[PDB]
């Protein structure tokens, strides 16, 4: 399973981060080795987001 929902708005100016909105659904493609960042996919594209900004959806 890899479906999540955003807990908060997140946006960074750094390249390769994805902007997400609270309540938006997303899928996680990859995980960093310390579990702190997730590579997310939404209708707005692909990019990294903090893992503590998302939570699973069954």
From Swiss-Prot:
Q: List the expressing tissues.
A: Widely expressed.
> What domain of life is recorded for the organism?
Eukaryota
Q: Which residues form the SH3 domain?
A: 1-58
Give the Phosphotyrosine positions (modified residues): 8, 53
Please describe the quaternary structure of this protein: Interacts with SORBS1 following insulin stimulation. Found in a trimolecular complex containing CDK5 and CABLES1. Interacts with CABLES1 and PSTPIP1. Interacts with ZDHHC16, ITGB1 and HCK. Interacts with STX17; probably phosphorylates STX17. Interacts with INPPL1/SHIP2. Interacts with ABI1, ABI2, BCR, CRK, FGR, FYN, HCK, LYN, PSMA7 RAD9A, RAD51, RAD52, TP73 and WASF3.
Disease as annotated in the protein's UniProt record: Leukemia, chronic myeloid: A clonal myeloproliferative disorder of a pluripotent stem cell with a specific cytogenetic abnormality, the Philadelphia chromosome (Ph), involving myeloid, erythroid, megakaryocytic, B-lymphoid, and sometimes T-lymphoid cells, but not marrow fibroblasts. A chromosomal aberration involving ABL1 has been found in patients with chronic myeloid leukemia. Translocation t(9;22)(q34;q11) with BCR. The translocation produces a BCR-ABL found also in acute myeloid leukemia (AML) and acute lymphoblastic leukemia (ALL).
Q: What is this protein called?
A: Tyrosine-protein kinase ABL1
Source species:
Homo sapiens (Human)
Write the span of the intact protein that is present.
63 to 120 of 1130
């Amino acid at each position: 399973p890899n479906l999540f929902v955003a807990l908060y708005d997140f946006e960074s100016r750094t390249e390769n981060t994805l902007s997400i909105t609270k309540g938006e659904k997303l899928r996680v493609l990859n995980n960093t080795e310390n579990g702190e960042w997730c590579e997310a996919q939404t209708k707005n594209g692909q990019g990294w987001v903090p893992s503590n900004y998302i939570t699973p959806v069954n």
